PDB file of C-alpha atoms in Angstrom:
ATOM      1  CA  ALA A  15    -186.844-133.818  58.199  1.00  0.00           C
ATOM      2  CA  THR A  16    -187.310-137.863  58.520  1.00  0.00           C
ATOM      3  CA  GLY A  17    -185.251-140.577  59.976  1.00  0.00           C
ATOM      4  CA  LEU A  18    -181.374-139.797  60.400  1.00  0.00           C
ATOM      5  CA  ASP A  19    -181.945-136.788  58.563  1.00  0.00           C
ATOM      6  CA  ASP A  20    -183.358-135.448  61.652  1.00  0.00           C
ATOM      7  CA  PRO A  21    -180.596-133.163  63.083  1.00  0.00           C
ATOM      8  CA  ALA A  22    -180.793-134.631  66.506  1.00  0.00           C
ATOM      9  CA  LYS A  23    -180.941-138.198  65.120  1.00  0.00           C
ATOM     10  CA  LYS A  24    -178.179-137.263  62.656  1.00  0.00           C
ATOM     11  CA  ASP A  25    -176.015-136.351  65.875  1.00  0.00           C
ATOM     12  CA  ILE A  26    -176.998-139.237  67.548  1.00  0.00           C
ATOM     13  CA  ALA A  27    -175.603-141.391  64.472  1.00  0.00           C
ATOM     14  CA  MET A  28    -172.664-139.319  64.894  1.00  0.00           C
ATOM     15  CA  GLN A  29    -172.285-140.222  68.525  1.00  0.00           C
ATOM     16  CA  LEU A  30    -172.704-143.831  68.158  1.00  0.00           C
ATOM     17  CA  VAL A  31    -170.199-143.983  65.462  1.00  0.00           C
ATOM     18  CA  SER A  32    -167.662-142.245  67.935  1.00  0.00           C
ATOM     19  CA  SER A  33    -168.206-144.979  70.617  1.00  0.00           C
ATOM     20  CA  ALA A  34    -166.887-147.384  68.393  1.00  0.00           C
ATOM     21  CA  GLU A  35    -164.013-145.378  66.814  1.00  0.00           C
ATOM     22  CA  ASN A  36    -163.135-143.155  69.407  1.00  0.00           C
ATOM     23  CA  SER A  37    -164.638-144.697  72.595  1.00  0.00           C
ATOM     24  CA  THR A  38    -165.998-141.753  73.362  1.00  0.00           C
ATOM     25  CA  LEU A  39    -169.457-139.587  72.247  1.00  0.00           C
ATOM     26  CA  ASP A  40    -167.057-136.702  71.507  1.00  0.00           C
ATOM     27  CA  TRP A  41    -166.964-137.086  67.794  1.00  0.00           C
ATOM     28  CA  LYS A  42    -165.911-133.291  67.119  1.00  0.00           C
ATOM     29  CA  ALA A  43    -162.811-133.835  69.293  1.00  0.00           C
ATOM     30  CA  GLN A  44    -161.120-135.662  66.261  1.00  0.00           C
ATOM     31  CA  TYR A  45    -160.958-132.534  64.180  1.00  0.00           C
ATOM     32  CA  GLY A  46    -157.652-131.820  64.692  1.00  0.00           C
ATOM     33  CA  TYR A  47    -156.406-135.564  65.126  1.00  0.00           C
ATOM     34  CA  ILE A  48    -153.899-136.357  62.790  1.00  0.00           C
ATOM     35  CA  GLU A  49    -151.166-139.351  63.065  1.00  0.00           C
ATOM     36  CA  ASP A  50    -149.382-142.212  60.801  1.00  0.00           C
ATOM     37  CA  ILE A  51    -150.608-145.269  62.818  1.00  0.00           C
ATOM     38  CA  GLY A  52    -148.262-147.600  60.384  1.00  0.00           C
ATOM     39  CA  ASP A  53    -151.234-149.320  58.514  1.00  0.00           C
ATOM     40  CA  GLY A  54    -149.883-148.352  54.929  1.00  0.00           C
ATOM     41  CA  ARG A  55    -151.867-145.481  54.740  1.00  0.00           C
ATOM     42  CA  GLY A  56    -149.764-142.523  55.809  1.00  0.00           C
ATOM     43  CA  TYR A  57    -151.412-139.717  57.790  1.00  0.00           C
ATOM     44  CA  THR A  58    -154.718-140.538  59.199  1.00  0.00           C
ATOM     45  CA  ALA A  59    -156.483-137.418  60.516  1.00  0.00           C
ATOM     46  CA  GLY A  60    -159.687-135.730  61.269  1.00  0.00           C
ATOM     47  CA  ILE A  61    -163.263-137.177  62.163  1.00  0.00           C
ATOM     48  CA  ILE A  62    -163.645-140.014  59.911  1.00  0.00           C
ATOM     49  CA  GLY A  63    -159.620-140.842  59.348  1.00  0.00           C
ATOM     50  CA  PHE A  64    -159.406-139.294  56.193  1.00  0.00           C
ATOM     51  CA  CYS A  65    -155.945-140.401  54.629  1.00  0.00           C
ATOM     52  CA  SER A  66    -153.168-139.066  52.716  1.00  0.00           C
ATOM     53  CA  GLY A  67    -152.419-142.366  50.952  1.00  0.00           C
ATOM     54  CA  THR A  68    -155.763-143.040  49.685  1.00  0.00           C
ATOM     55  CA  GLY A  69    -156.886-139.711  48.313  1.00  0.00           C
ATOM     56  CA  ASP A  70    -159.841-138.727  50.532  1.00  0.00           C
ATOM     57  CA  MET A  71    -157.689-136.478  52.713  1.00  0.00           C
ATOM     58  CA  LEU A  72    -156.358-134.791  49.305  1.00  0.00           C
ATOM     59  CA  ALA A  73    -160.142-134.277  48.463  1.00  0.00           C
ATOM     60  CA  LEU A  74    -160.793-132.798  51.628  1.00  0.00           C
ATOM     61  CA  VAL A  75    -158.213-130.478  51.286  1.00  0.00           C
ATOM     62  CA  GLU A  76    -159.038-129.875  47.621  1.00  0.00           C
ATOM     63  CA  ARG A  77    -162.558-128.465  49.032  1.00  0.00           C
ATOM     64  CA  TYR A  78    -161.539-126.733  51.959  1.00  0.00           C
ATOM     65  CA  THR A  79    -159.412-124.558  49.680  1.00  0.00           C
ATOM     66  CA  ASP A  80    -162.046-124.049  47.037  1.00  0.00           C
ATOM     67  CA  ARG A  81    -164.053-122.358  50.046  1.00  0.00           C
ATOM     68  CA  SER A  82    -161.039-120.844  51.646  1.00  0.00           C
ATOM     69  CA  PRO A  83    -158.079-120.176  49.328  1.00  0.00           C
ATOM     70  CA  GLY A  84    -154.820-119.359  50.976  1.00  0.00           C
ATOM     71  CA  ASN A  85    -155.484-121.443  54.102  1.00  0.00           C
ATOM     72  CA  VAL A  86    -152.946-122.892  56.017  1.00  0.00           C
ATOM     73  CA  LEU A  87    -153.117-126.529  54.301  1.00  0.00           C
ATOM     74  CA  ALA A  88    -153.030-125.153  50.692  1.00  0.00           C
ATOM     75  CA  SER A  89    -149.443-124.990  50.384  1.00  0.00           C
ATOM     76  CA  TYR A  90    -149.401-128.800  50.893  1.00  0.00           C
ATOM     77  CA  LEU A  91    -151.583-129.645  48.095  1.00  0.00           C
ATOM     78  CA  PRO A  92    -148.753-130.588  45.402  1.00  0.00           C
ATOM     79  CA  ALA A  93    -147.572-132.927  48.006  1.00  0.00           C
ATOM     80  CA  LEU A  94    -150.698-134.385  48.668  1.00  0.00           C
ATOM     81  CA  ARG A  95    -151.363-134.774  45.311  1.00  0.00           C
ATOM     82  CA  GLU A  96    -148.161-136.237  45.079  1.00  0.00           C
ATOM     83  CA  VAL A  97    -148.184-138.859  47.800  1.00  0.00           C
ATOM     84  CA  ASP A  98    -151.551-140.147  47.060  1.00  0.00           C
ATOM     85  CA  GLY A  99    -151.793-143.692  46.717  1.00  0.00           C
ATOM     86  CA  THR A 100    -148.581-144.059  49.064  1.00  0.00           C
ATOM     87  CA  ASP A 101    -147.495-143.978  52.722  1.00  0.00           C
ATOM     88  CA  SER A 102    -145.107-141.368  52.067  1.00  0.00           C
ATOM     89  CA  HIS A 103    -144.585-137.898  54.104  1.00  0.00           C
ATOM     90  CA  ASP A 104    -142.821-136.286  51.495  1.00  0.00           C
ATOM     91  CA  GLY A 105    -143.409-132.738  51.391  1.00  0.00           C
ATOM     92  CA  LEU A 106    -145.743-132.902  54.638  1.00  0.00           C
ATOM     93  CA  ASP A 107    -143.204-133.391  57.471  1.00  0.00           C
ATOM     94  CA  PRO A 108    -142.210-131.553  59.597  1.00  0.00           C
ATOM     95  CA  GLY A 109    -144.981-128.976  59.449  1.00  0.00           C
ATOM     96  CA  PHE A 110    -147.950-130.746  58.436  1.00  0.00           C
ATOM     97  CA  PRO A 111    -149.386-131.971  61.729  1.00  0.00           C
ATOM     98  CA  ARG A 112    -148.719-128.835  63.217  1.00  0.00           C
ATOM     99  CA  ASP A 113    -150.854-127.013  60.328  1.00  0.00           C
ATOM    100  CA  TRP A 114    -153.481-129.368  60.323  1.00  0.00           C
ATOM    101  CA  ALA A 115    -154.070-128.988  64.131  1.00  0.00           C
ATOM    102  CA  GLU A 116    -154.267-125.360  63.131  1.00  0.00           C
ATOM    103  CA  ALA A 117    -156.567-125.554  60.415  1.00  0.00           C
ATOM    104  CA  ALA A 118    -159.123-127.725  62.878  1.00  0.00           C
ATOM    105  CA  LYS A 119    -159.521-124.416  64.657  1.00  0.00           C
ATOM    106  CA  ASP A 120    -161.270-122.924  61.802  1.00  0.00           C
ATOM    107  CA  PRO A 121    -165.206-123.593  61.317  1.00  0.00           C
ATOM    108  CA  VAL A 122    -165.029-123.503  57.660  1.00  0.00           C
ATOM    109  CA  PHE A 123    -162.506-126.983  57.873  1.00  0.00           C
ATOM    110  CA  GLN A 124    -164.779-128.302  60.319  1.00  0.00           C
ATOM    111  CA  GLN A 125    -167.491-127.499  57.967  1.00  0.00           C
ATOM    112  CA  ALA A 126    -165.588-129.195  55.179  1.00  0.00           C
ATOM    113  CA  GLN A 127    -165.025-132.089  57.056  1.00  0.00           C
ATOM    114  CA  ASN A 128    -168.724-132.416  57.793  1.00  0.00           C
ATOM    115  CA  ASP A 129    -169.401-132.168  53.990  1.00  0.00           C
ATOM    116  CA  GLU A 130    -166.906-134.913  53.210  1.00  0.00           C
ATOM    117  CA  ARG A 131    -167.919-137.450  55.992  1.00  0.00           C
ATOM    118  CA  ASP A 132    -171.759-136.712  54.402  1.00  0.00           C
ATOM    119  CA  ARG A 133    -170.796-136.710  50.600  1.00  0.00           C
ATOM    120  CA  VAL A 134    -169.182-140.149  50.647  1.00  0.00           C
ATOM    121  CA  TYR A 135    -170.862-142.003  53.867  1.00  0.00           C
ATOM    122  CA  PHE A 136    -173.946-140.414  55.338  1.00  0.00           C
ATOM    123  CA  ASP A 137    -175.943-139.208  52.749  1.00  0.00           C
ATOM    124  CA  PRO A 138    -175.264-142.306  50.443  1.00  0.00           C
ATOM    125  CA  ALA A 139    -176.341-144.693  53.458  1.00  0.00           C
ATOM    126  CA  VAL A 140    -179.205-143.014  54.389  1.00  0.00           C
ATOM    127  CA  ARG A 141    -180.546-142.824  51.214  1.00  0.00           C
ATOM    128  CA  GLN A 142    -180.394-146.507  50.486  1.00  0.00           C
ATOM    129  CA  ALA A 143    -181.767-147.351  53.776  1.00  0.00           C
ATOM    130  CA  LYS A 144    -184.903-145.125  52.947  1.00  0.00           C
ATOM    131  CA  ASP A 145    -185.055-146.631  49.527  1.00  0.00           C
ATOM    132  CA  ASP A 146    -185.061-149.826  51.219  1.00  0.00           C
ATOM    133  CA  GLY A 147    -187.989-148.541  53.397  1.00  0.00           C
ATOM    134  CA  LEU A 148    -185.961-148.559  56.487  1.00  0.00           C
ATOM    135  CA  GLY A 149    -186.768-146.674  59.732  1.00  0.00           C
ATOM    136  CA  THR A 150    -183.927-144.615  61.621  1.00  0.00           C
ATOM    137  CA  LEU A 151    -182.331-147.708  63.105  1.00  0.00           C
ATOM    138  CA  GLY A 152    -182.033-149.357  59.891  1.00  0.00           C
ATOM    139  CA  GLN A 153    -180.448-146.049  58.680  1.00  0.00           C
ATOM    140  CA  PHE A 154    -177.958-145.961  61.150  1.00  0.00           C
ATOM    141  CA  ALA A 155    -177.031-149.644  60.528  1.00  0.00           C
ATOM    142  CA  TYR A 156    -176.383-148.869  56.974  1.00  0.00           C
ATOM    143  CA  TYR A 157    -174.270-145.699  58.041  1.00  0.00           C
ATOM    144  CA  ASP A 158    -172.247-147.596  60.656  1.00  0.00           C
ATOM    145  CA  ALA A 159    -171.503-150.253  57.763  1.00  0.00           C
ATOM    146  CA  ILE A 160    -170.355-147.644  55.237  1.00  0.00           C
ATOM    147  CA  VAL A 161    -168.060-145.874  57.414  1.00  0.00           C
ATOM    148  CA  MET A 162    -166.214-149.157  58.676  1.00  0.00           C
ATOM    149  CA  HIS A 163    -166.700-151.002  55.207  1.00  0.00           C
ATOM    150  CA  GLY A 164    -166.500-148.003  52.819  1.00  0.00           C
ATOM    151  CA  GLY A 165    -168.949-147.735  49.436  1.00  0.00           C
ATOM    152  CA  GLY A 166    -165.948-149.888  46.893  1.00  0.00           C
ATOM    153  CA  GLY A 167    -166.693-152.938  45.255  1.00  0.00           C
ATOM    154  CA  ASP A 168    -164.678-155.419  47.224  1.00  0.00           C
ATOM    155  CA  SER A 169    -166.407-158.381  49.029  1.00  0.00           C
ATOM    156  CA  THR A 170    -167.030-156.941  52.230  1.00  0.00           C
ATOM    157  CA  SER A 171    -167.902-153.290  50.962  1.00  0.00           C
ATOM    158  CA  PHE A 172    -171.257-151.698  52.081  1.00  0.00           C
ATOM    159  CA  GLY A 173    -172.747-152.676  48.733  1.00  0.00           C
ATOM    160  CA  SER A 174    -171.409-156.334  48.895  1.00  0.00           C
ATOM    161  CA  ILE A 175    -172.811-156.532  52.409  1.00  0.00           C
ATOM    162  CA  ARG A 176    -176.116-155.299  51.436  1.00  0.00           C
ATOM    163  CA  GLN A 177    -176.515-157.858  48.587  1.00  0.00           C
ATOM    164  CA  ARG A 178    -175.764-160.552  50.981  1.00  0.00           C
ATOM    165  CA  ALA A 179    -178.440-159.291  53.403  1.00  0.00           C
ATOM    166  CA  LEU A 180    -181.095-158.848  50.366  1.00  0.00           C
ATOM    167  CA  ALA A 181    -180.324-162.564  49.235  1.00  0.00           C
ATOM    168  CA  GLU A 182    -181.472-163.818  52.864  1.00  0.00           C
ATOM    169  CA  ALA A 183    -183.918-161.561  53.271  1.00  0.00           C
ATOM    170  CA  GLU A 184    -186.819-159.090  51.437  1.00  0.00           C
ATOM    171  CA  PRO A 185    -186.516-155.487  52.207  1.00  0.00           C
ATOM    172  CA  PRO A 186    -189.692-153.850  53.639  1.00  0.00           C
ATOM    173  CA  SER A 187    -189.364-151.778  50.218  1.00  0.00           C
ATOM    174  CA  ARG A 188    -190.325-155.204  48.679  1.00  0.00           C
ATOM    175  CA  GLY A 189    -192.758-155.966  51.145  1.00  0.00           C
ATOM    176  CA  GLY A 190    -190.448-158.090  53.702  1.00  0.00           C
ATOM    177  CA  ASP A 191    -190.585-157.557  57.411  1.00  0.00           C
ATOM    178  CA  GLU A 192    -188.319-154.920  58.934  1.00  0.00           C
ATOM    179  CA  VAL A 193    -187.052-156.730  61.561  1.00  0.00           C
ATOM    180  CA  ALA A 194    -186.365-160.088  59.939  1.00  0.00           C
ATOM    181  CA  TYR A 195    -184.341-158.160  57.054  1.00  0.00           C
ATOM    182  CA  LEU A 196    -182.321-156.207  59.797  1.00  0.00           C
ATOM    183  CA  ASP A 197    -181.645-158.941  61.372  1.00  0.00           C
ATOM    184  CA  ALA A 198    -179.926-160.505  58.187  1.00  0.00           C
ATOM    185  CA  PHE A 199    -178.320-156.885  57.457  1.00  0.00           C
ATOM    186  CA  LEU A 200    -176.730-157.358  60.837  1.00  0.00           C
ATOM    187  CA  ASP A 201    -175.426-161.229  60.146  1.00  0.00           C
ATOM    188  CA  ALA A 202    -174.263-159.952  56.916  1.00  0.00           C
ATOM    189  CA  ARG A 203    -172.564-157.058  58.476  1.00  0.00           C
ATOM    190  CA  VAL A 204    -170.929-159.476  61.129  1.00  0.00           C
ATOM    191  CA  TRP A 205    -169.918-161.765  58.113  1.00  0.00           C
ATOM    192  CA  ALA A 206    -168.015-159.119  56.720  1.00  0.00           C
ATOM    193  CA  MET A 207    -166.265-157.978  59.761  1.00  0.00           C
ATOM    194  CA  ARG A 208    -164.980-161.628  60.580  1.00  0.00           C
ATOM    195  CA  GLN A 209    -163.670-161.522  56.958  1.00  0.00           C
ATOM    196  CA  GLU A 210    -161.616-158.542  57.262  1.00  0.00           C
ATOM    197  CA  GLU A 211    -160.358-159.862  60.864  1.00  0.00           C
ATOM    198  CA  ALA A 212    -160.946-163.305  62.011  1.00  0.00           C
ATOM    199  CA  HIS A 213    -160.939-162.704  65.709  1.00  0.00           C
ATOM    200  CA  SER A 214    -163.171-159.767  65.293  1.00  0.00           C
ATOM    201  CA  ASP A 215    -164.478-157.848  68.379  1.00  0.00           C
ATOM    202  CA  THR A 216    -168.009-157.563  66.608  1.00  0.00           C
ATOM    203  CA  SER A 217    -169.550-155.723  69.921  1.00  0.00           C
ATOM    204  CA  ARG A 218    -170.488-152.719  67.801  1.00  0.00           C
ATOM    205  CA  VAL A 219    -173.364-155.087  66.412  1.00  0.00           C
ATOM    206  CA  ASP A 220    -173.540-157.635  69.308  1.00  0.00           C
ATOM    207  CA  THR A 221    -173.821-155.262  72.155  1.00  0.00           C
ATOM    208  CA  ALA A 222    -175.456-152.272  70.004  1.00  0.00           C
ATOM    209  CA  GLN A 223    -177.372-152.577  67.118  1.00  0.00           C
ATOM    210  CA  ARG A 224    -178.640-156.047  67.425  1.00  0.00           C
ATOM    211  CA  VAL A 225    -179.843-154.872  71.002  1.00  0.00           C
ATOM    212  CA  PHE A 226    -181.828-152.059  69.728  1.00  0.00           C
ATOM    213  CA  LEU A 227    -183.302-154.531  67.211  1.00  0.00           C
ATOM    214  CA  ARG A 228    -184.294-156.724  69.932  1.00  0.00           C
ATOM    215  CA  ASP A 229    -185.725-154.081  72.002  1.00  0.00           C
ATOM    216  CA  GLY A 230    -188.053-153.010  68.679  1.00  0.00           C
ATOM    217  CA  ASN A 231    -186.441-149.553  68.883  1.00  0.00           C
ATOM    218  CA  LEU A 232    -186.713-149.159  65.012  1.00  0.00           C
ATOM    219  CA  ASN A 233    -186.880-145.460  65.342  1.00  0.00           C
ATOM    220  CA  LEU A 234    -183.890-145.126  67.595  1.00  0.00           C
ATOM    221  CA  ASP A 235    -185.430-143.104  70.346  1.00  0.00           C
ATOM    222  CA  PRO A 236    -183.425-142.479  73.461  1.00  0.00           C
ATOM    223  CA  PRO A 237    -182.669-143.529  76.137  1.00  0.00           C
ATOM    224  CA  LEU A 238    -180.148-145.473  74.233  1.00  0.00           C
ATOM    225  CA  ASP A 239    -177.781-147.764  76.256  1.00  0.00           C
ATOM    226  CA  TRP A 240    -175.147-149.659  74.564  1.00  0.00           C
ATOM    227  CA  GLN A 241    -171.689-151.291  75.161  1.00  0.00           C
ATOM    228  CA  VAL A 242    -168.775-151.328  72.244  1.00  0.00           C
ATOM    229  CA  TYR A 243    -165.656-153.005  73.503  1.00  0.00           C
ATOM    230  CA  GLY A 244    -166.847-153.391  76.943  1.00  0.00           C
ATOM    231  CA  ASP A 245    -167.421-149.739  77.435  1.00  0.00           C
ATOM    232  CA  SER A 246    -170.976-148.392  78.631  1.00  0.00           C
ATOM    233  CA  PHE A 247    -172.694-145.737  76.638  1.00  0.00           C
ATOM    234  CA  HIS A 248    -175.948-143.679  77.177  1.00  0.00           C
ATOM    235  CA  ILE A 249    -177.655-140.957  75.774  1.00  0.00           C
ATOM    236  CA  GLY A 250    -180.418-139.908  77.421  1.00  0.00           C
TER     237      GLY A 250
END
């Protein structure tokens, strides 16, 4: 019941991430979203942008189908298993986007999306932050990082960002000052964003996370006011 695991704080986290990914606090509006944006990942869909090309859409539909056999997306499993690793729409078109939108009306699919987001991103990020001895803000910083950068082994992954920060500063779990460590983590996060795109817009740190940190809002308590990409947001 503590930190970002508090239901109210958890939803604040989801809103904060949504402001950067969707330019709105309304993260749930994305349950039914589905498009191929031409990034090589095939169809990108749902609340975290599950992809047909990367395996996570497949894992999501498998889990939905375990809980709800013969649901509308179940017929697409052979195709999803086949196109995995590629941007191909073979076996998905023409009906997949329509059927995705229909499934998104099912609270069970919505819960499946929530649970996959939490299995891959939220639970690991919050658990690692708490182990490092960080408060709610720090827990949020880890979550936003893993959402954008993933939990892989690559040079700008969440794990790699964390390792960079630990080299510059000790975490509270090892006697370090929390503000100094969080400044190091945000530095590392910005370093990674710039590696992935040179002229990256780092506002989700610069005019949000760094601002909360400078305000000493270590427990991430409303009112929260921030900007991402120049749009202003407020949670009272």
